[PDB]
PDB file of C-alpha atoms and ligand atoms in Angstrom:
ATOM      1  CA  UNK H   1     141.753 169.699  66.680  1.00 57.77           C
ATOM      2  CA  UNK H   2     142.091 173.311  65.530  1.00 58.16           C
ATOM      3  CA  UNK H   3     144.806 175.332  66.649  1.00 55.95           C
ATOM      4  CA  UNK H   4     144.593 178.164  69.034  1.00 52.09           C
ATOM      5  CA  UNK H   5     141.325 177.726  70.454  1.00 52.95           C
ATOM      6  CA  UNK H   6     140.874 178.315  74.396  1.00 53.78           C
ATOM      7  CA  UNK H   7     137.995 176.947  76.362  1.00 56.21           C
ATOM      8  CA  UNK H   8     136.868 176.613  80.128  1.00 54.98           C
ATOM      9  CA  UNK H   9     134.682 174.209  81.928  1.00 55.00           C
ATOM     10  CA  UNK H  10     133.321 174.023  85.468  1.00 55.70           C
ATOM     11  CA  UNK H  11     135.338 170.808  87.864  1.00 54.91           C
ATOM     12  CA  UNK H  12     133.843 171.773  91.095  1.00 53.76           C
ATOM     13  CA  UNK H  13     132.391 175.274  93.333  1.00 47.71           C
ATOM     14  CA  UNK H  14     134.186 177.860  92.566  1.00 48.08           C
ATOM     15  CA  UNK H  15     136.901 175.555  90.316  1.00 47.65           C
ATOM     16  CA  UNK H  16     137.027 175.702  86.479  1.00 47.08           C
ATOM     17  CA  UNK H  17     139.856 174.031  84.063  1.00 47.85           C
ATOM     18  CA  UNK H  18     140.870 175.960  81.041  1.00 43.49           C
ATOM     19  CA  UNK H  19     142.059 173.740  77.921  1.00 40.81           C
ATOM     20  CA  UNK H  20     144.194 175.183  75.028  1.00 37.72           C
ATOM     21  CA  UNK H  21     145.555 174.023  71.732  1.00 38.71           C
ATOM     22  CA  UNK H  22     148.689 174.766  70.003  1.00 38.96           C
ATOM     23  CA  UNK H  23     151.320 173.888  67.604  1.00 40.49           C
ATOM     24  CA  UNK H  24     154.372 171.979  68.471  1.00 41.63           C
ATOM     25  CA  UNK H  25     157.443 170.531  66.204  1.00 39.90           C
ATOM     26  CA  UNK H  26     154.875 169.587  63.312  1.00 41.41           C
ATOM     27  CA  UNK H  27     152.110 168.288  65.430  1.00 42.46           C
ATOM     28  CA  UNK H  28     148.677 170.023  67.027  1.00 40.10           C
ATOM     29  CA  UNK H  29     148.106 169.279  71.156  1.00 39.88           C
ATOM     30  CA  UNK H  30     145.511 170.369  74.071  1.00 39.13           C
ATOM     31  CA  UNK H  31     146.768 171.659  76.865  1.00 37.74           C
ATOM     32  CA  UNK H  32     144.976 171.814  80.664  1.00 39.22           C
ATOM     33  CA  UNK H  33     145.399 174.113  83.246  1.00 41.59           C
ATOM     34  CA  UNK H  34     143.412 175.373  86.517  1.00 40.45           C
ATOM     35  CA  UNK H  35     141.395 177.655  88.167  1.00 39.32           C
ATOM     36  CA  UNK H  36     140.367 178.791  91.453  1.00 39.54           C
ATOM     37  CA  UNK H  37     138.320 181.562  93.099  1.00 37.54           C
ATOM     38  CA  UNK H  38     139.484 182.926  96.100  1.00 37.04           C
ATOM     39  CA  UNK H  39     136.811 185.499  97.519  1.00 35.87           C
ATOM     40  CA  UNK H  40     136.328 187.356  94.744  1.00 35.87           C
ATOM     41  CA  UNK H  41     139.940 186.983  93.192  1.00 34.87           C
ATOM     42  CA  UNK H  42     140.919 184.537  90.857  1.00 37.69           C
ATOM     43  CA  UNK H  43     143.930 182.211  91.086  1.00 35.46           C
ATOM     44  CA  UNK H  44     145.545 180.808  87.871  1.00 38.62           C
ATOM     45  CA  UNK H  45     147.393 177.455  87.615  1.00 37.54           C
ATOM     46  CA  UNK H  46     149.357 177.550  84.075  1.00 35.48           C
ATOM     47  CA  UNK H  47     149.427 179.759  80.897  1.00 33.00           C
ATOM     48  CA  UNK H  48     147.753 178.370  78.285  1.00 35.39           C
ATOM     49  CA  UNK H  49     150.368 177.920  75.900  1.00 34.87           C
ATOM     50  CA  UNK H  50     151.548 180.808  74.421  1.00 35.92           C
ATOM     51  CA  UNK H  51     150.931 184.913  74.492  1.00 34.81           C
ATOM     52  CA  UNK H  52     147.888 185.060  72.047  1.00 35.33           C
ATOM     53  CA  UNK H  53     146.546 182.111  73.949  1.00 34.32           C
ATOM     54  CA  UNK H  54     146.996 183.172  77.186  1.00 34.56           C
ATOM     55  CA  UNK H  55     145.463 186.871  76.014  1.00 32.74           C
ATOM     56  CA  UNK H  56     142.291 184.627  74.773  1.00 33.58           C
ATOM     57  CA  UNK H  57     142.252 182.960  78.229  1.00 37.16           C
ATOM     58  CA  UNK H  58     142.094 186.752  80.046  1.00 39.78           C
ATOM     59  CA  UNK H  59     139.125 187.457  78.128  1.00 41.78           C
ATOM     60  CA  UNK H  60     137.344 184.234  77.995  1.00 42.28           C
ATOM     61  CA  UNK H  61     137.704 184.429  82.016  1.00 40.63           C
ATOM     62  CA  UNK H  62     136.422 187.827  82.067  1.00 40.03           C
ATOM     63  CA  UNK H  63     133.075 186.801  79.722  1.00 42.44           C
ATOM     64  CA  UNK H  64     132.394 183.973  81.445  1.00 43.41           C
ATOM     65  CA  UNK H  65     133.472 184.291  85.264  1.00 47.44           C
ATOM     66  CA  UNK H  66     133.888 188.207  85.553  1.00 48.05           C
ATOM     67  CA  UNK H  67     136.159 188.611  88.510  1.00 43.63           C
ATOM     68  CA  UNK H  68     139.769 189.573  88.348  1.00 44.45           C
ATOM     69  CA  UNK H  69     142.924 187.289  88.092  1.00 43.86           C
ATOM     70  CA  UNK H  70     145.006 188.772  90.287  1.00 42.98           C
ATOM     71  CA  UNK H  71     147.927 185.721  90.834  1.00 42.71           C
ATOM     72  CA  UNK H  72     149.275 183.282  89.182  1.00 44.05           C
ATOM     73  CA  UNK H  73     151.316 179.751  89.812  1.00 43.79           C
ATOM     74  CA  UNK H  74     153.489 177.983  86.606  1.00 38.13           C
ATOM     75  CA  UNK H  75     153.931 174.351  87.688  1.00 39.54           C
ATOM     76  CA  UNK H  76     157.161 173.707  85.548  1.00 41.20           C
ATOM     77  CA  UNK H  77     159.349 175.852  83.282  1.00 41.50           C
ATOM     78  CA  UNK H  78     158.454 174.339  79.706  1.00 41.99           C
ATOM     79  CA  UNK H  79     156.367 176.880  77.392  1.00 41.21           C
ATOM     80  CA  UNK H  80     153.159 175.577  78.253  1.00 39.46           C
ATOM     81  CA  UNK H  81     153.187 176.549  81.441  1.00 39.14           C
ATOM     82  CA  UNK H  82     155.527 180.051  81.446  1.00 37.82           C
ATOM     83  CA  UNK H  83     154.519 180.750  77.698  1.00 34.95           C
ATOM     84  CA  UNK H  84     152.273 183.801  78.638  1.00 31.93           C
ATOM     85  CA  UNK H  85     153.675 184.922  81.685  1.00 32.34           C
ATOM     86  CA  UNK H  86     154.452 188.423  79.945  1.00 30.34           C
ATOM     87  CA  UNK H  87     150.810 189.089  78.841  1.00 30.56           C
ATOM     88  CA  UNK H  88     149.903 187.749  82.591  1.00 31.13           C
ATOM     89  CA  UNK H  89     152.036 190.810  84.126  1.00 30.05           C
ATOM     90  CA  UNK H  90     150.657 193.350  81.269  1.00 29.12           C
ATOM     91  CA  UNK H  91     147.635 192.643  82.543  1.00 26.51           C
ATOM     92  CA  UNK H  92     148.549 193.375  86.355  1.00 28.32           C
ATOM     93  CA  UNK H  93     148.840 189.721  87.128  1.00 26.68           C
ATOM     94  CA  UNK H  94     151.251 188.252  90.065  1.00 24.54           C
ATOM     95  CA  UNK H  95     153.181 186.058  88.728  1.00 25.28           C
ATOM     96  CA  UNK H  96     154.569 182.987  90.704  1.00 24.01           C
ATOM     97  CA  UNK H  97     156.982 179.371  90.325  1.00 21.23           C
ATOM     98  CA  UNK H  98     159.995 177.844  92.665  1.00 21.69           C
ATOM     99  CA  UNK H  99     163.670 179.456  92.079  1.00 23.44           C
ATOM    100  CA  UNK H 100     164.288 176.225  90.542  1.00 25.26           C
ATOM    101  CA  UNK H 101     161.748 176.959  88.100  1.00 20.61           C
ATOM    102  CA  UNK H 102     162.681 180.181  87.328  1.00 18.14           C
ATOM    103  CA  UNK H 103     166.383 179.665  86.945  1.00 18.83           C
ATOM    104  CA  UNK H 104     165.285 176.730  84.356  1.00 16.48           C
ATOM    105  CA  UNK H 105     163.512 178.857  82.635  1.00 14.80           C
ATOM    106  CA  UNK H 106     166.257 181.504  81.939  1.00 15.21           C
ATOM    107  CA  UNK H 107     167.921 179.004  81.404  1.00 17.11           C
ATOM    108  CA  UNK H 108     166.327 177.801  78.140  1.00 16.58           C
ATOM    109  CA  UNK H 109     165.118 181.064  76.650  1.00 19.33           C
ATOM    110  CA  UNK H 110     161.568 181.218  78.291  1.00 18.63           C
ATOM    111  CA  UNK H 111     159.783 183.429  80.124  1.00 20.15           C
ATOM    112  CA  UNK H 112     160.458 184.375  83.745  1.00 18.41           C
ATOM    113  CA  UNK H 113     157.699 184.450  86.365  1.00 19.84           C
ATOM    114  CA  UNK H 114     158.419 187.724  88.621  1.00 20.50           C
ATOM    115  CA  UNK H 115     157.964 186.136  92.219  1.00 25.14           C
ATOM    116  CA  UNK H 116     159.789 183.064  93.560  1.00 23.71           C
ATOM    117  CA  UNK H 117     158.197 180.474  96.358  1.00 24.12           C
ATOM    118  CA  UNK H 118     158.933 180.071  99.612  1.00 22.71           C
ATOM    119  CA  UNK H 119     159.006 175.968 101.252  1.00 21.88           C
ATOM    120  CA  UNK H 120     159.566 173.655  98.271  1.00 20.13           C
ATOM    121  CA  UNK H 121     162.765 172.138  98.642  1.00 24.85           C
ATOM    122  CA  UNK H 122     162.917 168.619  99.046  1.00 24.94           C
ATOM    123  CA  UNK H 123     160.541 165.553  97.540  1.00 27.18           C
ATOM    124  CA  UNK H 124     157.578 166.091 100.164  1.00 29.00           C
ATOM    125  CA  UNK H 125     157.461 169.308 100.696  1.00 32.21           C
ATOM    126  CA  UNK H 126     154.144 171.388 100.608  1.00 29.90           C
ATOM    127  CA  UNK H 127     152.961 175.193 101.242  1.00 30.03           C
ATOM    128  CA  UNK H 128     149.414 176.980 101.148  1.00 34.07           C
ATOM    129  CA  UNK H 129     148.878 179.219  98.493  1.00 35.88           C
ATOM    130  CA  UNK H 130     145.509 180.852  98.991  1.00 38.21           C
ATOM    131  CA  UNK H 131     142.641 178.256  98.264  1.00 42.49           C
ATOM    132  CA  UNK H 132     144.995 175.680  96.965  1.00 41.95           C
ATOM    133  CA  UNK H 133     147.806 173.325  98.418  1.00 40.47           C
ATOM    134  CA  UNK H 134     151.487 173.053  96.261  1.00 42.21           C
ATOM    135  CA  UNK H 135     153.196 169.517  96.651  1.00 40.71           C
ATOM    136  CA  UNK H 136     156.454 169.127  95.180  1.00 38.67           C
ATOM    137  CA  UNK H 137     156.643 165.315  94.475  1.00 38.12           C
ATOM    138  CA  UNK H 138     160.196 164.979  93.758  1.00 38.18           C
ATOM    139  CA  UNK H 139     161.589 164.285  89.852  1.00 37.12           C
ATOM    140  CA  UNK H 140     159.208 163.367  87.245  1.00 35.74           C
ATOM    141  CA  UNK H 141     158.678 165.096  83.695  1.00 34.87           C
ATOM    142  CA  UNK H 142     161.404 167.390  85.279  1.00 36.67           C
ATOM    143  CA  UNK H 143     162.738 167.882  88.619  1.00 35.11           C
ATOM    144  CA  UNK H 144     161.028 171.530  89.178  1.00 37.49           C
ATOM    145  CA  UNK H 145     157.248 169.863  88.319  1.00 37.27           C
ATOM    146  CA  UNK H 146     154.783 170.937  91.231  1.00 37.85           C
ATOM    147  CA  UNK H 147     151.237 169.755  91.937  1.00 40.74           C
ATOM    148  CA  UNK H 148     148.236 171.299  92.869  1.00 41.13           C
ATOM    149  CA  UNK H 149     145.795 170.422  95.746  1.00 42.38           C
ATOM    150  CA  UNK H 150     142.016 172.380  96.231  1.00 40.96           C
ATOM    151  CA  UNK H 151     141.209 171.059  99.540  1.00 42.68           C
ATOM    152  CA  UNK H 152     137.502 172.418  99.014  1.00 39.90           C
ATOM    153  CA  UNK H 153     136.534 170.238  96.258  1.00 37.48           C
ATOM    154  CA  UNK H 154     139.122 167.475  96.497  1.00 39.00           C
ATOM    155  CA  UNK H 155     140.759 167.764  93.083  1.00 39.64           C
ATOM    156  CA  UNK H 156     143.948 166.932  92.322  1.00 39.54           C
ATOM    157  CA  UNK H 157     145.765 168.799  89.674  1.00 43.78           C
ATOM    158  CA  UNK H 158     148.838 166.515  88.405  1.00 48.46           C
ATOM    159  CA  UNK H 159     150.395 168.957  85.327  1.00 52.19           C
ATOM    160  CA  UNK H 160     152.513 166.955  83.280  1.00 49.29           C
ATOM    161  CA  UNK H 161     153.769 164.648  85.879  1.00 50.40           C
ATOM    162  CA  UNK H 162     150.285 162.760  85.556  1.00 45.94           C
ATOM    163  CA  UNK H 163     149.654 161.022  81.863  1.00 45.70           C
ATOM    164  CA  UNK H 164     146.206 160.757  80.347  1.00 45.35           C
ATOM    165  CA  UNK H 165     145.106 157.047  80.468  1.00 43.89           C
ATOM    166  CA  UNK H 166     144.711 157.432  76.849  1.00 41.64           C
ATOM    167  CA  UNK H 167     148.610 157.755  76.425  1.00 39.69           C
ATOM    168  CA  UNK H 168     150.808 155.544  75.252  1.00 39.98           C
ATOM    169  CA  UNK H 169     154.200 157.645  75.448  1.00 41.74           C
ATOM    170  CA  UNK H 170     155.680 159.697  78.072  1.00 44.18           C
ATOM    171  CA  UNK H 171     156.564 162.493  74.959  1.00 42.84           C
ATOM    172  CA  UNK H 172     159.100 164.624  75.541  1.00 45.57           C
ATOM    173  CA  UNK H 173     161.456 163.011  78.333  1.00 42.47           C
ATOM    174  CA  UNK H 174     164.509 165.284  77.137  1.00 46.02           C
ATOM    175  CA  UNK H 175     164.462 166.554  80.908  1.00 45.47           C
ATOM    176  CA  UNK H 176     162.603 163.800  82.714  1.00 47.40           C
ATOM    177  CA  UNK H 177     163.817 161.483  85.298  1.00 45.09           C
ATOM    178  CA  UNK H 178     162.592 158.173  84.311  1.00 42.25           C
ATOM    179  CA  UNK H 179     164.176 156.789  87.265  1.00 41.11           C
ATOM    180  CA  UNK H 180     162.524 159.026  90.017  1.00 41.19           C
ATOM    181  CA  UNK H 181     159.153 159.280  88.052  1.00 41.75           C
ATOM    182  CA  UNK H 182     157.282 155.827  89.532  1.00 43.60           C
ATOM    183  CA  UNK H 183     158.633 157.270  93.483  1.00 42.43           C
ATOM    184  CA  UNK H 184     157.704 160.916  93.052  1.00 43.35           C
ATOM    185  CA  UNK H 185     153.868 159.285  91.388  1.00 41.22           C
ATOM    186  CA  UNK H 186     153.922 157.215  94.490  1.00 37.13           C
ATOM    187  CA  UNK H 187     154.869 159.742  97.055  1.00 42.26           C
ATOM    188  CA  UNK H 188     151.809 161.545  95.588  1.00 43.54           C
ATOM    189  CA  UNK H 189     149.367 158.507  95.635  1.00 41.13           C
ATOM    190  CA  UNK H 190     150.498 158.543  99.684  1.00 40.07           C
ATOM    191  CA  UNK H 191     149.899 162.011 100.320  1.00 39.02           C
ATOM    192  CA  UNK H 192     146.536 162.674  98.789  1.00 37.02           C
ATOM    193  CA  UNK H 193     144.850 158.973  98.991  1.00 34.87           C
ATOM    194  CA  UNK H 194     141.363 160.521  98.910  1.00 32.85           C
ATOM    195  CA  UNK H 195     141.623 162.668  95.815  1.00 32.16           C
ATOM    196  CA  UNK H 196     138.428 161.886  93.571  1.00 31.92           C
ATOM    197  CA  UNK H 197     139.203 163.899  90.106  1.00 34.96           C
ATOM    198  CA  UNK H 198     142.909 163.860  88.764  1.00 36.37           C
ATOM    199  CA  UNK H 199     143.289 166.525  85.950  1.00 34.31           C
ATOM    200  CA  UNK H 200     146.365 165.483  84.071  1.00 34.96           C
ATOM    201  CA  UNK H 201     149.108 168.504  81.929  1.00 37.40           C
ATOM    202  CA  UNK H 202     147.032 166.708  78.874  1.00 33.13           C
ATOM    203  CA  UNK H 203     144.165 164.790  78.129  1.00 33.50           C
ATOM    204  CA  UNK H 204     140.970 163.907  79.660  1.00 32.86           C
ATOM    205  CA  UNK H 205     140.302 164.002  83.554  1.00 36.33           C
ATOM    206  CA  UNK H 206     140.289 160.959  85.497  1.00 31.57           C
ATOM    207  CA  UNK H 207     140.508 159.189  88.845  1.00 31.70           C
ATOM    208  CA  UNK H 208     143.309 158.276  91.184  1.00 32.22           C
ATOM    209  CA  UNK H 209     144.138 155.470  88.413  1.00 33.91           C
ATOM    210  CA  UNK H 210     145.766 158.003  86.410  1.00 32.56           C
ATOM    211  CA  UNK H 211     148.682 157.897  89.079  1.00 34.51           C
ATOM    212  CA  UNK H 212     149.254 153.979  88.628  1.00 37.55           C
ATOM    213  CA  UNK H 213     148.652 154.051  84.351  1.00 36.63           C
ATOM    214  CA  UNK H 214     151.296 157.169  84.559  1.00 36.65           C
ATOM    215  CA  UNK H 215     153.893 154.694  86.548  1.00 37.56           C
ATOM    216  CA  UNK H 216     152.710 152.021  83.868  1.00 39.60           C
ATOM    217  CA  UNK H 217     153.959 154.348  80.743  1.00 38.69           C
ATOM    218  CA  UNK H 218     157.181 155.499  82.549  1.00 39.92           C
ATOM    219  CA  UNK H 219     158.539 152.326  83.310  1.00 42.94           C
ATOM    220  CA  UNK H 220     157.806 151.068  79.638  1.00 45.79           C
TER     221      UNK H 220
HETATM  222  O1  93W Z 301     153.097 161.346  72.183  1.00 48.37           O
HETATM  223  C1  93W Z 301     152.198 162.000  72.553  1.00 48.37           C
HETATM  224  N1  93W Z 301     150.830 161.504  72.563  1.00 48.37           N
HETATM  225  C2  93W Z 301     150.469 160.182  72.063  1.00 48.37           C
HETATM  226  C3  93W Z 301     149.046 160.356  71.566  1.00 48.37           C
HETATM  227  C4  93W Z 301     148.031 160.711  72.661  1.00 48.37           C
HETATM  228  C5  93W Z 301     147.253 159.801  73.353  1.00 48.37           C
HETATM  229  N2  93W Z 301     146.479 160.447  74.210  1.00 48.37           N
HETATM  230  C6  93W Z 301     146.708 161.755  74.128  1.00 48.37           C
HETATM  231  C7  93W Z 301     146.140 162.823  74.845  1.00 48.37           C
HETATM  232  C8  93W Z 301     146.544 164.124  74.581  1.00 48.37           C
HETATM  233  C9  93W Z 301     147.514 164.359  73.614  1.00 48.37           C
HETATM  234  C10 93W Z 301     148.076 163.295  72.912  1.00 48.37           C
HETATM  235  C11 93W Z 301     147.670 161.977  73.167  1.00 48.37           C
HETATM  236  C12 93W Z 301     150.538 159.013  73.025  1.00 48.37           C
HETATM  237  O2  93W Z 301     150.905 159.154  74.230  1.00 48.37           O
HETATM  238  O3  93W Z 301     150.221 157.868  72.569  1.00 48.37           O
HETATM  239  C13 93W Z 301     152.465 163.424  73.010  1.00 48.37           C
HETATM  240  N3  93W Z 301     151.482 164.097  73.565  1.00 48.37           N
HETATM  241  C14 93W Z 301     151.663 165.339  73.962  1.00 48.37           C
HETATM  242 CL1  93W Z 301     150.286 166.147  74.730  1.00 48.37          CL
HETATM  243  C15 93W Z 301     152.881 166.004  73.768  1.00 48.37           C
HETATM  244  C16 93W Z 301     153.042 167.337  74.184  1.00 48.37           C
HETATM  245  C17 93W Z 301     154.257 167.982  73.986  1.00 48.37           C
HETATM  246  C18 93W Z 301     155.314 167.313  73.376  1.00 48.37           C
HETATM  247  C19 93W Z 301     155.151 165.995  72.963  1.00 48.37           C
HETATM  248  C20 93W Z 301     153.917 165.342  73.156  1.00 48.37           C
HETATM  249  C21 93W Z 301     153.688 164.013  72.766  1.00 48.37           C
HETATM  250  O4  93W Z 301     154.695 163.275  72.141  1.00 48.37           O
HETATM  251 ZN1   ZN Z 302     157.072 170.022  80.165  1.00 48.93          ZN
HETATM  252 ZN1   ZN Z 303     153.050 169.500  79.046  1.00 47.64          ZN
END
């Protein structure tokens, strides 16, 4: 609706989303990301969208929750998922993608998470990261996209490899393969069958239909 406004909301025990809005080529979005208490540390999943948003985030975290974020995962190397990272390590935040991310993201001007992870390689792969589980699905809305598991509460978060069912358009395909997308959606369909909330990169949260709608979209 309005732009630059940053909320949270509570998925599970110990599991919140954060939502963001910002401006984009002429047009206003939301934006999701996750996150999930470890002890009594915080993990992040995503910026939200920018430095002033991601600042916002910080302090809306510390209000609401009041322990510290002390790492942080981007899930792809676009801006609303990196856009923030500098604030992030201002404030003492790890920061955290794949080397494929963060070569991607030098690549196109953005910025650079400081610490690269170890085990995602191939389509398949997947690696503990504190409370959480990273699956790399293989090539989707780009080939770097991860997802993210919390075995605790069985949510599945599907970043912008997993469409809203309220979408009509996969958006911005300039570095998506429409090709791979409908395998890498299945390979995650196989690997968590049991998942009971999917919260997509925008848009409302759903079920495991998400995964099939997303193939529906792709292939149109
Ligand atoms: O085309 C989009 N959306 C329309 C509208 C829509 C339905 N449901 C939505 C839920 C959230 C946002 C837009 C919607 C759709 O698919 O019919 C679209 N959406 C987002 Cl996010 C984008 C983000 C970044 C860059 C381009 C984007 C984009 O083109
Ligand atoms: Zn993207
Ligand atoms: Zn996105």
């Amino acid at each position: 609706i309005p732009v630059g406004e940053v909320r949270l909301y509570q998925i599970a025990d110990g599991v919140w989303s954060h939502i963001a809005t910002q401006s984009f080529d002429g047009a206003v979005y939301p934006s999701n990301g996750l996150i999930v208490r470890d002890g009594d540390e915080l993990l992040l999943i995503d910026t939200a969208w920018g430095a002033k948003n991601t600042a916002a985030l910080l302090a809306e975290i510390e209000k609401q929750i009041g322990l510290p974020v002390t790492r942080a995962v981007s899930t792809h190397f676009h801006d609303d998922r990196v856009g923030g990272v500098d604030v992030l390590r201002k404030a003492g935040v790890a920061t955290y993608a794949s080397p494929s991310t963060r070569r991607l993201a030098e690549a196109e001007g953005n910025e650079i998470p400081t610490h690269s992870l170890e085990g995602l390689s191939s389509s398949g792969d997947a690696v503990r990261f504190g409370p959480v589980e990273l699956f790399y699905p293989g090539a989707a809305h780009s080939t770097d996209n991860l997802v993210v598991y919390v075995p605790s509460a069985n949510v599945l978060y599907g970043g912008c490899a997993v469409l809203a069912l309220s979408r009509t358009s996969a958006g911005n395909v300039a570095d998506a393969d429409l090709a791979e997308w409908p395998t890498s959606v299945e390979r995650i369909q196989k690997h968590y069958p049991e998942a009971e909330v999917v919260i997509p990169g925008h848009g409302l949260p759903g079920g495991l239909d998400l995964l099939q709608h997303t193939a529906n979209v792709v292939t149109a």
